Amino acid sequence: IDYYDYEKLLEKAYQELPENVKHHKSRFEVPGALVTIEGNKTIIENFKDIADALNRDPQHLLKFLLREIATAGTLEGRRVVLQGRFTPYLIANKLKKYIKEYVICPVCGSPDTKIIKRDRFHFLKCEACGAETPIQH
């Protein structure tokens, strides 16, 4: 895809564009990543804001990351320490996926999905439609 075909470039630009912001149903309160790479460690000190905006636990996300990524981190007073170096977009791309498979309903898109547990199995989901997707993916 050549750089002069603005159109395609535009649609290519909106798929990467997050959910909450990309399409119809918009949880819109998700503030973008704030990344600070100090010395040899990456720190997203805007974390709380993200989780609290996604209405998801704090450590439920710390994990999803260290999963998609291979580092170690600890949460603290609304910030997070990552053991290596990660560009704001690397992280920016992982949060995108989280919202997609842990905060949105695939039948009726709704930021209102919630983590539930009705067996040792983590079926979590929707307070609006009622669909209970099995999410561990």
Binding site: Y6, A13, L17, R85, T87
Partner: protein, 407 residues
């Protein structure tokens, strides 16, 4: 050679469309010691940020990161570049006109959620136009803030804005510096456009010293603890460890006349470029030279503004200066500040050439030409562009530029 920075990309655009955000986002991961990720500069408040453009071997996409942002595999080094960012619509402007010999390309960041040509955005395109910088990439940012209707209207606007300019053939990449929408497309474009030029390394060396220091600190070892160190942008040829260099204006002496700078010579001990130490540095990014000089001479950035090169082959130092004045048609500011009254005999101007900054006194007037005595000698090659800035109240406002002529 080194994997050091091969080209200086200037980050220009309005003062809020997002130039600084995009820069950090792309350079954050390439700042390890004695520089937490981002800060602006000395007199040319210019700032240099390095970034390694890499290619994901698995998905095939480009980024500025070691681990593919998307798939997660290891990326491959393709090149190292350096962005020149600067908070302050003026400072950038001054830098561009003055040290146009530093940039090799520029990335015009234009916010999509505002009328295309903003007062400031025009001035840069105006500056880029004046220094013959044609290698330009346009970054329509904040695409996530305008529905596809407005976006296309903005796109069109930009197109009308650039036609008949140096950025007439520049791509218009819709991106999101915040979320990273199309950063891969962008980074890739930096390779398509703005490639490393063909430079004949054999040309005699010339470096514009941006800063000078005394890395010494009561660490106390008395042995071979480093001497004076200079940081600058090689702009011609190359410097090599073990090279004998000639600093330009030089060190001042005790009033025989009043003030007199004598050119000084020293030997290069070390060279930092790309985060490591090399035996040979080239243009692109910042270069940290280590000398055998008395740190007492470079401490406090006194050497700043000087030029380095091989003894004999350097520019001509000047004590006086005539210039081919060209006042600019500025739009940013207030009507007063705007319509610049022509320079007057005896007015005290602020001059910028290379990395040197000095006050000059207008001692002559002609037709679109003037004369000036320098407060501080400045090392310059005739034909080189000099930034001219008048005061206007408490601040210093750029009113135009002059062309170095012979007296």
């Amino acid at each position: 050679k080194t994997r050091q920075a091969e080209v200086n990309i200037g980050m220009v655009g309005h003062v809020d469309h997002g130039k600084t955000t995009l820069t950090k986002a792309l350079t954050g991961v390439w700042t390890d010691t004695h520089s937490e990720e981002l800060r602006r500069g000395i007199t040319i408040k210019i700032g240099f940020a390095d970034a390694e453009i890499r290619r994901c071997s698995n998905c095939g996409r480009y980024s500025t990161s070691p681990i593919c942002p998307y798939c997660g595999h290891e990326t491959e080094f393709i090149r190292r570049v350096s962005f020149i960012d600067s908070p302050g619509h003026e400072a950038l402007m001054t830098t561009m006109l003055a040290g146009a010999s530093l940039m090799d390309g520029a990335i015009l960041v234009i916010a999509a959620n505002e009328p295309c040509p903003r007062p400031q955005t025009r001035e840069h395109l105006m500056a880029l136009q004046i220094i013959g910088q044609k290698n330009i990439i346009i970054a329509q940012n904040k695409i996530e803030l305008v529905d596809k209707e407005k976006a296309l209207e903005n796109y069109r606007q930009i197109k009308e804005f650039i036609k008949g300019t140096v950025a007439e053939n520049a791509p218009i990449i819709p991106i999101s510096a915040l979320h990273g929408a199309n950063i891969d497309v962008l980074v890739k474009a930096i390779e398509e456009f703005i490639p490393t030029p063909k430079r004949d390394s054999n040309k005699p060396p010339k470096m514009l010293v941006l800063r000078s220091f005394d890395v010494n600190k009561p660490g106390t070892p008395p042995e071979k603890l480093v001497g004076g160190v200079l940081d600058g942008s090689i702009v011609q040829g190359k410097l090599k460890v073990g090279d004998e260099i000639e600093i330009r204006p030089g060190v001042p002496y005790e009033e025989h006349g009043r003030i007199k700078y004598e050119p000084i010579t020293t030997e290069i001990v070390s060279l930092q470029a790309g985060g490591q130490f090399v035996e040979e540095a080239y243009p692109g990014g910042l270069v940290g030279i280590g000398t055998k000089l008395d740190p007492y001479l470079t401490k406090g950035d006194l050497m700043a503004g000087n030029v380095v090169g091989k003894p004999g082959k350097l520019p001509p130092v000047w004590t006086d200066l005539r210039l081919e004045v060209h006042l600019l048609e500025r739009v940013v500011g207030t009507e007063q500040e705007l319509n610049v009254e022509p320079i007057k005999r005896k007015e005290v101007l602020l001059l910028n050439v290379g990395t040197a900054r000095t006050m000059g006194l207008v001692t002559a007037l002609g037709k679109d030409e003037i004369e000036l005595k320098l407060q501080i000698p400045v090392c310059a090659e005739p034909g080189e562009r000099v930034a001219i800035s008048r005061q206007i109240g408490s601040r210093w406002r750029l009113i135009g530029y002059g062309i170095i002529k012979e007296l």
